[PDB]
Symmetry: D2
Subunit: 448 residues, 4 copies
């Protein structure tokens, strides 16, 4: 319940708060959503401040005592020990300068407890600006989310789908095209398609990493690097790669592009949106397969968490949210001006949420839905034995001409191929029942 | 770390948690976003459960001691006293059944402390289903957000813009079309346009209320009202209207449409998306008019909150982007219902209620901390209007279009007013008095302000 | 071919072209999409220029021989006699000034063929600017599309759905929630829900018309009305309303808002987007209820419209629901383009008008045309599989609840279990377990298990 | 009119039309948009039908005489001689059945003129389904649009922006952050950023090609390849690669994924949407740069076509359309069921249009706007030299208070910072002219040479 001195008046700050005047001013300025930065974003801001202090100490610009204090305070933030010291709304100044200052002030307060005096700006923000810090922290968080969390969760889901594709390789059923009875497929073939969609999803995330991992650090206020060392960015990136193990982090190809635009986030969101499109198809098919029992398709049983398909519902709802977040990201991305895109906090919220939702729902879908599915094998065969058949596999036995006459008579009389063959008296020396039954076998027709 | 026994086994629940086994199972099944219901949707579930108990009591279906205990517990929820007792993810079963059961369990636990035993399902969920309750609460929350919070916030912003329009009635400046110099307007006219965009926004929200306020309560599992009293819906709506004063709440025109679809939320989101479009135009223009102080337009100065950065225009345009994205998520969920139930309700509810909250809060902040304190560079704006090639056209009938083009070119080159340029080129004569020049170049008259 | 001279130089123009040099420059400047204005937009530009000439004549600003020639030329354009004379890309200068000049030039060329010389700017564009004309024509076209075409098409679909709701009033079936078996409904109730969605869609279009019908005409370059008569807008609107019968057309409430923004198009697109969301639900349910007919739900049969497959000769597909869902997808995309253009005005003018007009008019057209085809070629001819639906309802575990008060919920659960195992009706299963006697007569069971009464049909 | 027949019976067809019964049913079933397939789509269908006939001939399944007649007619269709014989609406059955039958019927009618009888389904559709042919034609058209048309157009725009970046390397000006005056940049640096966005655009398009170029051909009705040779897909793709030179065309990794989903079109549309986002930033900045000539920024002059920024307006309208199309594509993409995604004609319309608009507008922007921009060089430098943003490097010599007084007086009097420092009498005590000129060198402050 203490008081502080801002160069435009007095500021009242909570007693257990490590933030100071500028942060409390942002709290008062932006009461919009009531939600602040996520743990991933706070962690990335701590990682960045420790790396910058390390490079400023290495170049002789910051006294080793001060640098050690920033590095220890930053490590605490990166390890999640201060997730309650970042109270600023997401809907803040569009550079994220408010959250940048919040990080500077918390490090200064942590350092003061350990007996060292740090200036938030002059020491913790040395060689940095209001504008190259928050987008760097955003891209660190997004790249960690892609590489450490999302890709492994998608691989878990891919592996679960692929395991079912192999278990069910010969579980024959009816194909459905336009929702109408089609020629046979196997449940395994369908699951091989779902698994490819997720494998292609991982390919799509991997393809965006060369641009998602681009960091602005070192470009300072406008991209020129004025008031930073010439190699600040390259040096800070190498410390971040060393401390995170994220080899995908890199300096920006062009320091102006990296601050004027957030195109890498727009690109990454498009991969997530494609994954959401794939997941929607997979989840919808699985809840339709599970439907009924009496009124639906009743092809598979879902694990109970008459079972409602609650994890397909959570997946399709997450996909809707990723599609909406993706529209917000593109809207912010397009609306930069000159040297700075000022939609960074909103874009950060949306892409980091999309990563988190897809990671968590993919691992739940894989573990608590896909792994436990059971096929209703005899029902699925009954459906395959009700699919349309074709005459092609009789060509070698009755010839192109009789086969075409079977096809025409089956269509006119609304009969099966098999029954039309029997009815036309074709069972004989050229075609036993056995030969008819082997040629028209529904698992053979699936070409598994 | 207290321990409970379920139909499937044993679950540990936090000691000070008022939720029970079903909520704890939902917490375990849906660790997806780490974000649960918002205050408005918890309040509405409290309002709904209180009105349902009142009606079940009035119809002689529920013992009055139990009904009174539910009503007192539901009032505490509606008053925001238990916002920490709703831990289930937004990304839950798509009917919102898990959150419905969370409400039933919390009410039973609150009642237990006052010495009254309630069964969550048989008593707190009496006459209700797993499918007509959550969407009712969603539409109560959205209707209240629209009528009680957003419309008044938009009226505050309208009135701030209109006050600026009146203050700046005679503040003449260059028009701009295609970003290029155009004939004169006043800042007041421009702000009159902004005010109309916000007044039309209020009309758009008002226009959606006949369908936003439709409640599914009484339709039970599929819309038929099986296992509810025949008049349960109209009775519960009447209690909600009597208690809340929200006369916009109404039974649904068609019980099936009210559960198979959430088209009222899609409709309302379109009104919020239009307001977000309007606010983007208003906020962009204001930050461009404040740009500078040297190399920008330097028309106005914004009040300093954090050379002032336009931080509230940035908040407004970021909120608008969020509303656009939320609007896309809502329409996606809305389209994808099947047969008797749309199972995207928790996601739709999160997005629609957030959109209401962000637009309400940012509209008030923009009105009070940006619009009200803008200051115009009045003399500078008039000098630029008076120096613009766009104003030479009214000279054509005195000096011809080719001499008027030469006046325009020299005025720009020498950074002079059109008036001073006409005098410097020796055009004052019998063909054009000083008085006729000042009439022809009266830029405030060119703006045609009331 | 035939030469001309623009203040920039000599321009070659096709011989049968009624456009002139400014239009030919715009053709050369914007080869982007290869698509120009639609018939509805051309018609509205013709309506507008005819009304402007009438007013300019009435106010003594334009000589009558000149006004009469513009009126006669503008009526030919509004009648669709010149839909090949508007070659400019949609993706043009964002005020639509290129298309406005195209209209002025085509009118001057028509008037020339009758011996009257019209200056495209000074006569055909009198009292107008490059910025209040194209948005006015856009709003006229959109209002016409809403009132004369879309609402009657939606009413036709509403009536077709409501006729099925009545015909199927007693067609009992199992509900589905989460795609899982639920308590009984009727096919008529479900179709009553679809009908309400369309009726609500008409209410949504009607609710947007007070602002969709607002016209910018009279505001000139920046909204101030400089260089027009003070009452030009109300006079032009009066003529348009009298000639067209479009009672929704009105002068804008605020002349700056009507040129700085196109918020009425964004608003109207939201209504269309909501209709696309409703149609998606209706069409999806209908193709699911038609699915199979051996491996799907087989609740209804859709009318056959064309062969489905060479490989599977008997197979017929739900082509109209596919056309409806694809249209809905296009409306939702168009809606995103409209809102993007709407947000990005600057100062006195929104310069996304041609792109917003393309998208809003296409959404109107696709929804009008598909709604009529869906009603006529799909809904009107649906047939229900009444006995299949009733069999499933009478076999459903969901219908045992009404037995609770006679045999208890535990015995009712055992009846459900056994019926679902032995593929029997609930009625038969109650008999097969000897529960008919003291507390439960055979007519009492038939009263409790009346599936149509459980649907609670009005 | 004449009488034609299909499995559903007899149909009246315009006497002279080359289509037959199924096309005419589709003309009556789908009068929705009044727009049919584009030139690119008709070309891809003609290419595919010729390639299928070559492979059927090579495998001895189709008589050489019939394969020759199909190949010749498919070449006339591909070359654009019969576009007026493709009347079917975009909004047709969602597999593109109707447009597949349109191609088969028109090939049969052309072959009949030359005295060869072809059955549209038994000969022209041999070893094929709609479900594999229409998505294959769509992916051929999209891959050709990406490689042959869009990437070269974007390279042209990249090169025009990079040429400006070089030409304007020393054209110092005010930076702008939040629309507010900031420390100096050069126009060249800004254009280098715009060039990077377009180069990255090209990288995004190239990164999607391993999946965009996947073709369904050979999977037939459901993905199983029933009723086709086991190697039909690999043979047909090899013929298409030889004929088109598009090495990016490839057999699908998984035949079921290639028919049950159109995820590669969704992926590709995301690249195009990101390009639209980049082009919006570039075009907005350029029209603001050109604003005025009195009351705006007046940094540059755009070439005339007082000039309105008409190609920036075309570029930002195109971008809005690509964002809309992108939403329609993702909506179709998500809504497949079981063995088939039935949104293909709508998804095809949208992505092919996005390719075309970006290609055409990128070339126009490059040639008729970027190439001809002129910079107000002296004006830009004067404002940079007059900005309060450049007073900071004086703080250590004159103190914060006097640096603030210098900035305030320079703004009020409309003078440079250098002239204001001299006017306030600060030379001698605090610093020398040599030190002043080092500290206020705006080109050096932009970290350019
Ligand atoms: C953001 O545009 C401006 C910002 C500041 C100033 S200022 O007042 O501070 N100052 C003018 C007085 C003398 C000192 C230099 C700058 C002017 C400008 N515009 C202009 O000069 C506009 C202009 C008029 N004739 C021109 C011819 C060529 C290019 C531009 C123009
Ligand atoms: C678009 O901004 C401009 C456009 C043109 C011109 S101009 O050169 O044609 N011209 C300059 C001489 C007299 C002023 C009017 C005419 C200047 C400007 N900006 C400014 O004066 C900037 C400015 C510096 N001190 C100020 C103090 C208050 C307000 C604005 C400013
Ligand atoms: Mg690595
Ligand atoms: Mg069945």
């Amino acid at each position: 319940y203490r008081i502080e001195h801002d160069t435009m008046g007095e500021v009242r700050v909570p007693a257990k708060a490590l933030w100071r005047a500028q942060t409390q001013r942002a709290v008062e300025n932006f009461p919009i959503s009531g939600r602040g930065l996520e743990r991933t974003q706070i962690r990335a801001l701590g990682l960045l401040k420790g790396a910058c202090a390390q490079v400023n100490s290495d170049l002789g610009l910051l006294a080793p005592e001060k640098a050690d204090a920033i590095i220890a305070a930053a490590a605490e933030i990166a390890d999640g020990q201060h997730d309650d010291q970042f109270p600023i709304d997401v809907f803040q100044t569009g550079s994220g300068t408010s959250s940048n200052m919040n990080t500077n002030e918390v490090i200064a307060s942590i350092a003061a407890k350990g007996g060292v005096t740090l200036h938030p700006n002059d020491d913790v923000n040395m060689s940095q600006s209001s504008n190259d810090t928050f987008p760097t922290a955003t891209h660190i968080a997004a790249t960690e989310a892609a590489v450490a969390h999302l890709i492994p969760a998608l691989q878990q889901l891919h592996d679960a789908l692929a395991a079912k594709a192999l278990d069910w390789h010969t579980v024959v059923k009816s194909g459905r095209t336009h929702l109408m009875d089609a020629v046979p497929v196997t449940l395994g073939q369908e699951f091989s398609g779902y698994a490819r969609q997720i494998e292609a999803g991982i390919e799509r995330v991997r393809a965006c990493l060369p641009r998602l991992g681009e960091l602005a650090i070192g470009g300072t206020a406008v991209g020129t690097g004025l008031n930073a060392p010439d190699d600040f960015g390259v040096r800070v990136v190498a410390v971040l790669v060393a401390q995170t193990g994220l080899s995908e982090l890199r300096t920006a190809a062009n320091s102006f592009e990296a601050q004027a635009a957030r195109d890498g986030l727009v690109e990454a969101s498009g991969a997530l949106r494609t994954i959401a499109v794939s997941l929607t198809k997979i989840a919808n098919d699985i809840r339709w397969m599970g439907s009924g029992p009496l009124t639906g398709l009743a092809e598979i049983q879902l694990p109970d968490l008459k079972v409602n398909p609650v994890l397909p519902e959570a997946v399709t709802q997450v996909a809707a949210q990723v599609i909406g977040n993706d529209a917000a990201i593109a809207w912010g991305g397009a609306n930069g001006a000159f040297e700075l895109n000022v939609y960074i906090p909103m874009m950060a919220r949306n892409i980091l949420e999309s990563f988190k939702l897809l990671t968590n729902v993919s691992r739940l879908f894989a573990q608590r839905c896909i792994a436990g599915l059971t096929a209703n094998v005899e029902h699925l065969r009954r459906l395959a034995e009700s699919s349309p058949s074709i005459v092609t596999p009789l060509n070698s036995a009755i010839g192109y001409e009789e086969a075409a006459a079977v096809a025409k008579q089956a269509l006119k009389e609304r009969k099966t191929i098999r029954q039309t063959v029997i009815d036309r008296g074709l069972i004989g020396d050229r075609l036993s029942i056995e030969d008819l039954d082997r040629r028209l076998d529904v698992l053979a027709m699936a070409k598994a």
